[PDB]
Design a binder for this molecule. Structure first.
Ligand SMILES: CCCCCCCCCCCCCCCCCC(=O)OC[C@H](CO[C@@H]1O[C@H](CO[C@H]2O[C@H](CO)[C@H](O)[C@H](O)[C@H]2O)[C@H](O)[C@H](O)[C@H]1O)OC(=O)CCCCCCCCCCCCCCCCC
Ligand SMILES: CCCCCCCCCCCCCCCCCC(=O)OC[C@H](CO[C@@H]1O[C@H](CO[C@H]2O[C@H](CO)[C@H](O)[C@H](O)[C@H]2O)[C@H](O)[C@H](O)[C@H]1O)OC(=O)CCCCCCCCCCCCCCCCC
Ligand code: CLA
Ligand code: CLA
Ligand code: CLA
Ligand code: CLA
Ligand code: CLA
Ligand SMILES: CC1=C(/C=C/C(C)=C/C=C/C(C)=C/C=C/C=C(C)/C=C/C=C(C)/C=C/C2=C(C)CCCC2(C)C)C(C)(C)CCC1
Ligand SMILES: CC1=C(/C=C/C(C)=C/C=C/C(C)=C/C=C/C=C(C)/C=C/C=C(C)/C=C/C2=C(C)CCCC2(C)C)C(C)(C)CCC1
Ligand SMILES: CC1=C(/C=C/C(C)=C/C=C/C(C)=C/C=C/C=C(C)/C=C/C=C(C)/C=C/C2=C(C)CCCC2(C)C)C(C)(C)CCC1
Ligand SMILES: CC1=C(/C=C/C(C)=C/C=C/C(C)=C/C=C/C=C(C)/C=C/C=C(C)/C=C/C2=C(C)CCCC2(C)C)C(C)(C)CCC1
Ligand SMILES: CCCCCCCS[C@@H]1O[C@H](CO)[C@@H](O)[C@H](O)[C@H]1O
Ligand SMILES: [Cl-]
Ligand SMILES: [Cl-]
Ligand SMILES: [Fe+2]
Ligand SMILES: [Mg+2]
Lengths: 30, 342, 62, 37, 81, 29, 334, 39, 451
């Protein structure tokens, strides 16, 4: 259970990186 | 209406080389005495009667080894006032008992309050928001936690940090060996805020300097800035593209960026302070119980966590007799923990 | 030869110190470049001579 | 030791190796004199 | 500009150095003599090299009583001679 | 003691002396 | 255009979401190899004989570690500085016992991170920026080199490289202190000034710009909406910030030139961290911290301890306990 | 008498700087001699 | 005052030497004056070392770095590296110091008095950085000069008394090299050796025949390369690969010097052939090996059977196997089994350390040497307290190997940083954006958005 929990959190962080990069709010100039 | 209070207020707030203010009345004497006490002690004052140590230029120490050392453990948490029951007005005896330590710690504490009041007072006069004062709450939380709260939870001021380069190093190593402080997630958050802050300092400074607009003919580019100019001196749009492409994300909002630069190191320091408040009570992150259960039962089970505790046990046994002289420890050669040969 | 040596060597040191100040000052000075230039020539040949003298006399004192 | 004939110059020899450092410092004296222009 | 004389004016003036060519060496010498006369040891209670231990003693004179600490230090000092 | 300190004093002054002599002469600094 | 030309245009394209570039051509595979190996090893690797004394240390989560105790464990002291790729092992089981993942990870990483630095130059060039962000990155990079490559070289083993783990890192620090008295070394002291000062100036800059933001929003919205990405006008009043800071200290202690300020912000942490890195890289060849052990002696010759001697006692504790089964002879010479 | 500029600032800096080097040097000398020398 | 302020030159005082980029005469002076500073230090430092030298203590107990370089060339030393005559050290020091005056004179002259640009004075001496043919010409001259220097080493070793050979049969001694290794399979073989353990790339060079032969090759390669570069101009592919500017060229050399610095660091840390331990002290590996040797000898004298003695871990206390089976010393020095040195090699057999040689053939000179090296290991503090970090004050020692490796690491590192700084700047300047982004032509503003 411990190992699963660590790996799960890490894998969520990795997914977050993906969304934060590729599915960011695009920066728009005025 | 036009009374003395208002007249004094006028004088205190004149625009002069060194601003004074109402805050100055507290800040200047307290800061001067804390600094002066440190210089006085490191130059002339021993730690023979409190620690069994030489600690001054006078006795032969150098800039790295001098200190104003804490009072003897037997003083407990005595304020150690010059006119108090220990020194009884005798300046020489007061120095020999460690009175300069409480002198520096307490004038220093009030001085810091004065400095933060100054930050508020000046901000108010110039008409800016008081975020610099807000940020300085971190240094205050560190000073108060480490120099006051920590020893107050312990037996005496003896165990506070002594004001000295080598003395502070000893304090770090004490915390490793006795508190396993590296293991503490509050210290780890500290580390991340300090190193993160340093990172942000480096990366923001370099980014601005490498996205500058050409605003002059000079190859040395500092003169192409005018404090009063309306326009940004560097390109946020180019900076943003660069980092988006190198690292994947980038700042797009300058107000967010500069807020984050406050938040990171300030939050880190505040977390480290919370940990030290726990160490005041020996409420450590010393162990992982699951690790210890396994290792006790299984003599083949070894991690870097177990290895570090062996180091800690060495530190404690080898340093305690000289570092804690009031305990009169005598540890026979045969009890000292040692590995093979060494 | 020891008297000759020891003197020749102190003369070399003293001349060296004179040249160390004088050559840059001469080169960067506006007036008297004519006179200066001759003296630097003089000092330079004299410096070289003295080096050779110490060098030779070395062997008769060592 | 230096050969005995040169022994008089020992104190001078003790100082020479530091001279290059003085050239760095000299650049500063010079620039101060021309106002770091 | 806040009203005071520029430092660079002050420290390149002859009068500044007339004053400070006296006061600076006077202070430095006074500090020197504070130590060389032994006064510093007496003011601050710092042991001289011969005053850490009695001749045959190899025990630190540690203060162990909060309220009698002054007297303990005094007794330690008596034990030296 | 004195020999080494006297040496480094004359060698030490040589550089600033050159600059000083040139400033006095309005030389090509 | 031919294929090579097209390929070159794509690699160096300023329009890729993430820049590739020629540096990136080496960086991408090496970082992916290092990452994938690290992740798998951190999860599932068996114990590793770090000290070459057939005493395997467990680093992975599945073999009894948590996030804090876990590590990828350095390669065996038996290997030393020898190159131990997978294909020099008789089997993956041997490779694993001997700490092969460590070498694969650190070598791919150091190559990849060096190319990350090159890539920062490269993109700056494609975008018409000035070139020196990469120089600031050389500071953390040099530090990683110091702990993963230079220190091992000096001591003669990758077993003395920093472990890839949280507790492993602390082990490396404590043993380094025992062996080099790093705290007493002026290059680590400069490093501390570098990171404490970087943190201080980070907070200071953030607080001063935040102090002086120009009112563009109401009380029921974030002040952040007062700045729009790419606006031409500066968003804070540097004159006010300087007015503040110059009074906090005194006028000539405050920067009124943004370029000069931002250069200082770069230089202070970068230079300090370069000295940190050089501290580790020179203690690699055992030029160690200042040693004032028994420097103060009384008229008889009794040792009068200073705080240096107390440090020394702590260091001794570390020294005598570390790698408790590895030394057979009285001196720890590497 | 107290006219600013009579002593050039580059000379004040050089002399002051030399003074700092001398006193710091004395302090390093003292690390090798007398108290604190280990001898 | 031509180009000697920021307004005229574009460079602030702190980048003042950049004002010299296109002023060939003044830049010649800076270069010649600098060469003077280098030569001055070599001379002055040698005389300081000689003044401070006590012949009967090892050099490495005396903070010497230059006398050991002179001794390694065979000057002033005899069997075992004993100093037999200090006069060669005095000569080298004096001649360098005298020569520095000449270089300083030329340097000062070109810097403040001579023509500030050389091009209208002489077509031969003047140059434009951007003239590719003239740059390769000057490069060519300097290659010839360097090749002649490499052949000077060869001449010293073969014709003018030899070099100090730590490996010489019957004990280290000065030896003339009559059969330098010419076989290019051996010479270029070093160049393709792995830099990892047991291989060590060029740093593994372990005999003077290979060293001398190497310099014969290098000298001929450099002379040929120089002629080549005088007689040709850069080809099209090189024209397209490089930036052609003074700052770019500086950058390339900074890169090269950085690389050389790291190599030198490794050379003095591991190599005991061209850095004889007699002069530089033992290497780190050597001293650790020497400790194991010391205690093997001691305990065997007491009756220990050192081949059969099992240590606490189950490995041999004194002797164990390397990962390929060779018999090596045990304890932590297992990491140093690639060490080789003349005091230890007589104990080595085909399968490594030989137990019968160990039991019967260890000579008192080997015991002495191992004890010497164990107790002069390259460990010590910044204030030159010899030994481990916890050792008490007593012994004033830091190995020359530690001084040389640390200094050269620091210098190589900052030279890499300088390479990056100047290469990045050269690029930007060549393309025209080293002073910043043109507000009215900001490149990113013409690029499509990333998303
Ligand atoms: C926020 C930032 C704001 C800006 C910062 C401002 C800084 C201003 C400076 C304030 C200085 C405070 C000094 C407090 C000294 C103190 O405490 O001194 C300690 C004394 C008590 O004395 C101690 O008491 C101990 C227990 O004694 C008792 O028990 C013994 C054993 O049985 C005996 O019976 C003995 O007779 C009996 O008295 C030992 O004797 C100790 O040696 C002795 O020092 O309490 C006291 O004066 C008072 C105790 C009550 C009030 C404490 C309020 C302040 C401290 C809060 C932090 C608490 C720490 C918790 C750690 C987590
Ligand atoms: C353009 C460049 C492009 C680069 C592309 C990458 C190509 C591959 C190179 C990778 C880096 C090498 C890593 C291993 C270095 C090492 O263990 O090097 C050590 C070797 C020496 O190896 C040793 O060499 C020894 C040779 O001595 C032998 O022979 C001797 C003869 O006297 C003695 O007898 C001795 O006792 C005996 O053992 C032995 O073989 C040892 O076992 C062996 O470990 O040095 C050497 O080969 C030379 C040293 C190389 C430089 C040092 C690396 C520094 C880089 C740091 C950069 C910081 C970056 C900052 C970024 C910001
Ligand atoms: C803003 C300035 C300032 C502040 C906040 C402090 C604060 C402090 N000082 Mg410092 N100090 C200062 C300036 C300051 N000092 C200056 C300028 C000097 C040089 C003279 C000193 C020299 C000094 C020494 C030598 C020592 C202290 C110490 C102290 C501490 C105890 C003070 C105390 O108990 O006061 C108590 C007094 C008050 C709080 C004043 C209250 C006034 C009330 C409101 C009015 C009532 C008065 C009443 C009518 C009197 C009648 C009594 C009668 C019946 C007999 C405290 C940290 C002690 C210390 O640090 O020990 C470790 C100590 O030994 N200080
Ligand atoms: C090895 C170090 C070195 C060398 C060789 C040089 C060389 C040079 N620099 Mg640089 N520079 C340096 C370090 C160096 N610099 C440093 C550290 C800085 C930062 C402080 C500078 C900042 C700097 C600036 C801001 C400028 C230069 C310029 C120059 C050139 C003209 C100098 C001049 O006009 O002098 C005028 C000075 C004098 C006439 C005073 C005397 C100078 C001489 C050389 C002293 C010699 C003393 C010596 C002991 C004599 C021995 C003689 C004996 C052998 C007979 C010259 C080629 C200038 C330039 O580029 O011009 C186009 C320029 O503007 N430099
Ligand atoms: C490669 C460069 C180098 C190396 C490896 C050495 C090595 C040594 N020198 Mg030498 N020396 C050098 C350059 C070097 N020197 C230079 C340029 C000078 C002219 C100043 C000298 C002048 C000199 C003197 C006068 C003496 C030595 C002595 C020594 C020994 C003791 C060093 C010591 O205690 O330092 C202490 C460490 C420091 C001062 C720290 C320096 C840290 C710098 C500031 C870091 C800079 C970073 C980067 C470059 C920017 C050691 C063998 C001593 C000796 O034993 O002679 C027999 C001695 O008396 N050296
Ligand atoms: C790399 C070094 C170098 C270079 C490229 C130059 C280049 C030049 N110098 Mg300079 N100079 C130098 C070093 C250098 N100098 C040194 C060290 C000194 C002090 C002695 C001088 C003193 C000097 C003066 C006083 C004058 C020049 C002048 C000149 C110009 C004419 C040279 C000529 O016609 O010679 C033609 C060739 C010869 C006379 C034959 C060469 C004889 C030499 C000694 C052979 C040595 C070769 C050997 C391989 C050197 C090894 C050096 C190594 C050990 C360090 C030319 C621009 C003149 C000038 O600028 O006019 C306005 C001028 O008046 N130079
Ligand atoms: C300081 C010495 C020096 C310098 C700066 C140069 C510089 C130059 N030479 Mg010359 N050259 C030299 C010495 C030098 N040469 C010598 C001694 C010789 C005789 C062998 C030559 C023979 C020579 C020839 C025949 C040619 C050049 C050419 C060139 C030009 C292109 C070089 C290039 O692209 O390099 C970069 C090298 C490459 C792009 C090759 C591939 C890169 C590999 C993968 C590098 C791997 C090494 C790595 C970093 C590890 C180091 C260890 C390693 C030894 C295993 C350039 C002007 C070319 C030219 O235009 O002539 C007119 C050319 O055709 N040179
Ligand atoms: C405590 C006390 C008090 C007070 C006191 C005081 C206030 C004092 C002051 C004091 C002081 C106020 C002192 C000072 C000192 C100083 C010093 C001792 C300094 C030193 C310095 C140095 C050494 C420097 C160096 C340098 C430089 C210059 C530059 C850069 C580099 C360097 C850093 C190297 C009273 C009476 C109230 C009460 C009782 C107690
Ligand atoms: C071999 C020989 C010789 C030679 C000599 C020489 C070559 C010399 C040189 C010399 C030199 C070359 C010198 C120099 C000096 C310098 C100095 C002494 C400087 C100092 C500086 C300072 C102190 C600074 C300060 C400052 C400034 C100015 C600015 C900013 C601020 C400051 C503070 C940083 C002789 C003749 C003896 C003879 C015998 C042998
Ligand atoms: C450009 C310039 C610069 C630089 C310069 C330089 C780097 C120069 C160099 C110079 C040099 C590099 C010089 C040298 C000199 C030398 C001499 C002057 C020598 C002499 C010698 C002698 C006199 C000898 C003696 C003796 C003998 C014979 C034997 C034994 C004993 C004795 C040692 C006594 C500066 C930075 C300032 C800046 C401005 C510009
Ligand atoms: C003396 C001796 C010897 C020998 C030596 C030799 C034989 C050497 C060689 C050497 C060599 C033979 C070297 C080479 C080098 C090379 C290099 C270092 C390269 C570089 C390159 C580069 C840097 C490139 C870059 C680039 C690329 C990659 C492409 C694109 C663009 C560019 C062009 C930028 C021996 C060891 C036996 C022994 C000891 C002594
Ligand atoms: C460039 C200046 C070099 C001066 C050359 C001095 C010769 S060196 C001289 O050569 C002799 C054989 O001829 C050897 O016997 C002797 O050992 C060696 O010292
Ligand atoms: Cl350990
Ligand atoms: Cl061992
Ligand atoms: Fe900013
Ligand atoms: Mg002293």
């Amino acid at each position: 259970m411990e190992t699963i929990t660590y790996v799960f959190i890490f894998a969520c962080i990795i997914a977050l990186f993906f969304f934060a990069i590729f599915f960011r709010e695009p920066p728009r100039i005025t | 209406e036009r009374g003395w209070f208002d007249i004094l207020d006028d004088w205190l707030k004149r625009d002069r080389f060194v601003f004074v203010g109402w805050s100055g009345i507290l800040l200047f004497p307290c800061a001067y005495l804390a600094l002066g006490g440190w210089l006085t002690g490191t130059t002339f004052v021993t730690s023979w009667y409190t620690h069994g140590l030489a600690s001054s230029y006078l006795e032969g120490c150098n800039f790295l080894t001098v200190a104003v050392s804490t009072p003897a453990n037997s003083m407990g948490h005595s304020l150690l006032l010059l006119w108090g029951p220990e020194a009884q007005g005798d300046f020489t005896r007061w120095c020999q008992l460690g009175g300069l330590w409480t002198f520096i710690a307490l004038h220093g504490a009030f001085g810091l309050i004065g400095f933060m009041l100054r930050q508020f007072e000046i901000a108010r006069l110039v008409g800016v928001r008081p975020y610099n004062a807000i940020a300085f709450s971190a240094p205050i939380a560190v000073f108060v936690s480490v120099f006051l709260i920590y020893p107050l939870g312990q037996s005496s001021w003896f165990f506070a940090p002594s004001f000295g380069v080598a003395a502070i190093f000893r304090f770090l190593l004490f915390f490793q060996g006795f508190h396993n402080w590296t293991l503490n997630p509050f210290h780890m958050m500290g580390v991340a805020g300090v190193l993160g802050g340093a990172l942000l300092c480096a990366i923001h400074g370099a980014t601005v300097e490498n996205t500058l607009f050409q605003d002059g003919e000079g190859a040395s580019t500092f003169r192409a800035f005018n404090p009063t100019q309306a326009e940004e001196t560097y390109s946020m749009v180019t900076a943003n593209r660069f980092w988006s492409q190198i690292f994947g994300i980038a700042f797009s909002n300058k107000r967010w960026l500069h807020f984050f630069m406050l938040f990171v190191p300030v939050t880190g320091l505040w977390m480290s302070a919370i940990g030290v408040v726990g160490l005041a009570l020996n409420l450590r992150s010393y162990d992982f119980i699951s690790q210890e259960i396994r290792a006790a039962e299984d003599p083949e089970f070894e991690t870097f966590y177990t290895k570090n505790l062996l180091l800690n046990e060495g530190i404690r046994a080898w340093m305690a007799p000289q570092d804690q002289p009031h305990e009169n420890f005598v540890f026979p050669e045969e009890v000292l923990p040692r590995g093979n040969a060494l | 030869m020891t008297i000759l040596f020891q003197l020749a060597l102190a003369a070399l040191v003293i001349l060296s110190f004179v040249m160390v100040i004088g050559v840059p000052v001469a080169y960067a000075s506006p007036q008297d470049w004519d006179r200066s230039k001759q003296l630097i020539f003089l000092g330079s040949g004299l410096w070289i001579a003295l080096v050779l003298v110490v060098g030779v006399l070395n062997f008769f004192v060592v | 030791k230096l050969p005995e004939a040169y022994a008089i110059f020992d104190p001078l020899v003790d100082v020479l190796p530091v001279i290059p450092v003085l050239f760095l410092a000299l650049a500063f004296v010079w620039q101060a004199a021309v106002g770091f222009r | 500009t806040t009203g005071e004389r520029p430092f660079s004016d002050i420290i390149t003036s002859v009068r500044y150095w007339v004053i400070h060519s006296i006061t600076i060496p006077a202070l430095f010498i006074a500090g020197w003599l504070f130590v060389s006369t032994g006064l510093a040891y007496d003011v601050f209670g710092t042991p001289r090299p011969d005053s850490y231990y009695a001749q045959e003693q190899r025990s630190i004179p540690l203060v162990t009583d909060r309220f009698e600490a002054k007297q303990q230090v005094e007794t330690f000092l008596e034990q030296l001679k | 003691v004195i020999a080494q300190l006297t040496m480094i004093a004359m060698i030490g002054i040589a550089g600033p002396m050159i600059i000083f002599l040139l400033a006095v002469r309005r030389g090509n600094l | 255009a031919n294929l090579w030309e097209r390929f070159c245009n794509w690699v160096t394209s300023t329009d890729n979401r993430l820049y590739v570039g020629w540096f990136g051509v080496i960086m991408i595979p090496t970082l992916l190899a290092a990452t994938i190996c690290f992740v798998i090893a951190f999860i599932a690797a068996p114990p590793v004989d770090i000290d070459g004394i057939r005493e395997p240390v467990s680093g992975s989560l599945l073999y009894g570690n948590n996030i804090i105790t876990g590590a990828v464990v350095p390669s065996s002291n038996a290997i030393g500085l020898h190159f131990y790729p997978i294909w020099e092992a008789a089997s993956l089981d041997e490779w694993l016992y001997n700490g092969g993942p460590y070498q694969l990870i650190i070598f791919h990483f150091l190559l990849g991170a060096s190319c990350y630095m090159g890539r920062q130059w490269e993109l700056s060039y494609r975008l018409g920026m000035r070139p020196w962000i990469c120089v600031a990155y050389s500071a953390p990079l040099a530090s990683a080199f110091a702990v993963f490559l230079i220190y091992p070289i000096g001591q003669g083993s990758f077993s003395d490289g920093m472990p890839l783990g949280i507790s492993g890192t602390f082990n490396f620090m404590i043993v380094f202190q025992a062996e080099h008295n790093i705290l007493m070394h002026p290059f680590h002291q400069l490093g501390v000034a570098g990171v404490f000062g970087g943190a201080l100036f980070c907070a200071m800059h953030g607080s001063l710009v935040t102090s002086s933001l120009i009112r563009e929003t109401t009380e029921t919205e974030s002040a952040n909406y007062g700045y729009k990405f790419g606006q031409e006008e500066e968003t804070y009043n540097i004159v006010a910030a300087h007015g503040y800071f110059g009074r906090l200290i005194f006028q000539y202690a405050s920067f009124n030139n943004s370029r000069s300020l931002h250069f200082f912000l770069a230089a202070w942490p970068v230079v300090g961290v370069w000295f940190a890195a050089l501290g580790i890289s020179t203690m690699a060849f055992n030029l160690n911290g200042f040693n004032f052990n028994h420097s103060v002696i009384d008229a008889k010759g009794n040792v009068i301890n200073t705080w240096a001697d107390i440090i020394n006692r702590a260091n001794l504790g570390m020294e005598v306990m570390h790698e408790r089964n590895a030394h057979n002879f009285p001196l720890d010479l590497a | 008498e107290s006219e600013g500029g009579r002593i050039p600032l580059w000379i004040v800096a050089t002399v002051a700087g030399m003074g700092v080097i001398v006193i710091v040097g004395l302090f390093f000398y003292g690390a090798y001699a007398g108290l604190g020398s280990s001898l | 005052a031509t180009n000697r302020d920021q307004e005229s030159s574009g460079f602030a005082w702190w980048a003042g030497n950049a004002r010299l980029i296109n002023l060939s005469g003044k830049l010649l002076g800076a270069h010649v004056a600098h060469a003077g500073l280098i030569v001055f230090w070599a001379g002055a430092m040698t005389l300081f070392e000689l003044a401070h030298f006590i012949p009967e203590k090892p050099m490495y107990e005396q903070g010497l770095i230059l006398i050991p370089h002179i001794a390694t060339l065979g000057w002033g030393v005899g069997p075992g590296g004993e100093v037999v005559d200090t006069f060669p050290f005095f000569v080298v020091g004096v001649v360098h110091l005298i020569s520095s005056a000449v270089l300083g004179f030329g340097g000062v002259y070109h810097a403040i008095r001579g023509p500030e640009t050389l091009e209208e004075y002489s077509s031969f001496f003047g140059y434009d950085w951007k003239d590719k043919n003239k740059m390769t010409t000057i490069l060519g001259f300097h290659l010839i000069v360097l090749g002649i220097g490499a052949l000077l080493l060869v001449a010293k070793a073969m014709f003018f008394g030899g070099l100090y050979d730590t490996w010489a049969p019957g004990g280290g001694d000065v030896r003339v090299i009559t059969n330098p290794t010419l076989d290019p399979r051996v010479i270029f073989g070093y160049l393709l050796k792995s830099p990892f353990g047991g291989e060590g790339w060029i740093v593994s060079v372990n005999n003077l025949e290979d060293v001398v032969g190497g310099h014969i090759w290098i000298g001929l390669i450099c002379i040929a390369g120089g002629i080549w570069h005088i007689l040709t101009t850069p080809f099209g592919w090189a024209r397209r690969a490089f930036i052609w500017s003074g700052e770019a060229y500086l950058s390339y050399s900074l890169g090269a010097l950085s690389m050389m610095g790291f190599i030198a660091t490794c050379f003095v840390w591991f190599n005991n052939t061209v850095y004889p331990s007699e002069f530089y002290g033992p290497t780190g590996p050597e001293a650790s090996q020497a400790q194991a040797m010391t205690f093997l000898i001691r305990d065997q004298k007491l009756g220990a059977n050192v081949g059969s003695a099992q240590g606490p871990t189950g490995l041999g206390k004194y002797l164990m196997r390397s990962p390929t089976g060779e018999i090596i010393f045990g304890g932590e020095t297992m990491r140093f089994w690639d060490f080789r040195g003349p005091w230890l090699e007589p104990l080595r057999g085909p399968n490594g350390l030989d137990l019968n040689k160990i039991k019967n053939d260890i000579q008192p000179w080997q015991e002495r040497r191992a004890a010497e090296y164990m107790t002069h290991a390259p460990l010590g503090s910044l204030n030159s307290v010899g030994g481990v970090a916890t050792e008490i004050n007593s012994v004033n020692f830091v190995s020359p190997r530690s001084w040389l490796a640390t200094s050269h690491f620091v210098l190589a590192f900052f030279f890499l940083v300088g390479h990056l700084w100047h290469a990045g700047r050269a690029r930007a300047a060549a393309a025209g954006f080293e002073k910043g982004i043109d507000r009215e032509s900001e490149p990113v503003l013409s690029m499509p958005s990333l998303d």
